[PDB]
Amino acid sequence: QQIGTLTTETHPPLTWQTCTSGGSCTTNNGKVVLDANWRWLHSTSGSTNCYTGNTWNTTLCPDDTTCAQNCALDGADYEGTYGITASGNSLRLNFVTNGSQKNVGSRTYLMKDDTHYQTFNLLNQEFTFDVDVSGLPCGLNGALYMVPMAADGGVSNEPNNKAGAQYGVGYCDSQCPRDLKFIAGSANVQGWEPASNSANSGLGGNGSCCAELDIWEANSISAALTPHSADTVTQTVCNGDDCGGTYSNDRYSGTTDPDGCDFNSYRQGDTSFYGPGKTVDTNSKFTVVTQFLTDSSGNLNEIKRFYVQNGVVIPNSQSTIAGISGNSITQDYCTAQKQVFGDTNTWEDHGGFQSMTNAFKAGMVLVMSLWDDYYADMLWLDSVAYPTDADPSTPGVARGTCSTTSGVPSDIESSAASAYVIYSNIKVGPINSTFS
Ligand SMILES: *[C@@H]1O[C@H](CO)[C@@H](O[C@@H]2O[C@H](CO)[C@@H](O)[C@H](O)[C@H]2NC(C)=O)[C@H](O)[C@H]1NC(C)=O
Ligand SMILES: *[C@@H]1O[C@H](CO)[C@@H](O)[C@H](O)[C@H]1NC(C)=O
Ligand SMILES: *[C@@H]1O[C@H](CO)[C@@H](O)[C@H](O)[C@H]1NC(C)=O
Ligand SMILES: *[C@H]1O[C@H](CO)[C@@H](O)[C@H](O)[C@@H]1O
Ligand SMILES: [Mg+2]
CATH number for the domain spanning 226: value is: 2.70.100.10
Alpha helix segments (H runs only) across 61-150: 64-70, 78-82
Going by their DSSP bridges, the two strands 71-73 and 2-3 should be labelled as parallel
Q: Which amino acid would we find at residue 339? A: Q
Instruction: Report the b/e string of 329-338 with b at 16+ CB within 10 A.
Output: bbeebbbbbb
Cβ–ligand 2 contact at 71 (below 6 Å): no
Q: Catalytic pick from 9, 126, 158, 212?
A: 212
Active site residue 212: yes
Q: 212 with 364: CB under 8 angstroms? A: no
Tally of structural domains, the chain: 1
DSSP 8-state code for residue 156: G
From ligand 3's centre to the CA of 184, what distance in Å?
41
Alpha-carbon distance 301 to 357, whole Å?
9
Q: If you count them, how many residues does the chain have?
A: 436
Task: Please name every residue paired with 228 in a beta bridge, in sequence order, or none if there are none.
Answer: 212
Q: 220 with 137: CB under 8 angstroms? A: yes
64 is in an annotated binding site: yes
Alpha-carbon distance 387 to 343, whole Å?
12
Q: 91 with 426: CB under 8 angstroms? A: no
Beta carbons within 10 angstroms of residue 297's beta carbon: 7
Alpha-carbon distance 170 to 185, whole Å?
8
Cα–Cα distances in Å, from 43 out to 47, 77, 243? 6, 19, 30
Give Cα 79 distance to the centre of its chain.
Answer: 21
Cα–Cα distances in Å, from 334 out to 69, 175, 386? 45, 19, 19
Q: 397 with 385: CB under 8 angstroms? A: yes
Q: Using N-to-C axis directions, what is the helix angle for 331-341 and 352-362, rounded to 10°?
A: 130
**Type and span of the H or E element at 354:** helix 352-362
Cβ–ligand 1 contact at 63 (below 6 Å): no
CA atoms within 13 A on the CB side of 193: 8
Cα–Cα distances in Å, from 258 out to 265, 274, 338, 425? 20, 24, 14, 30
Q: Which amino acid would we find at residue 153? A: G
Alpha-carbon distance 136 to 400, whole Å?
14
Structural domain span for residue 323 = 2-436
Alpha-carbon distance 324 to 342, whole Å?
12
Cβ–ligand 1 contact at 196 (below 6 Å): no
DSSP codes of every residue in 239-252:
EGGGG-STTSSSTT
Alpha-carbon distance 352 to 331, whole Å?
8
> What residues have their beta carbon closer than 5 A to ion ligand 5?
177, 179
CA atoms within 13 A on the CB side of 400: 30
Alpha-carbon distance 158 to 2, whole Å?
11
Alpha-carbon distance 3 to 175, whole Å?
27
Instruction: Report the b/e string of 228-244 with b at 16+ CB within 10 A.
Output: bbbebbbbbbbeeeebb
Conformational region of residue 323, where left means phi above 0, alpha means psi within -120 to 50, and beta covers everything else? left
Q: How was this structure determined?
A: X-ray
Alpha-carbon distance 359 to 352, whole Å?
11
* 3-state SS assignment for residue 331: helix
Gap between the terminal Cα atoms of the chain? 46
Q: Which of 141, 132, 82 has its CA nearest to residue 377?
A: 141
Find the largest Cα–Cα distance for the chain. 63
Q: 154 with 170: CB under 8 angstroms? A: yes
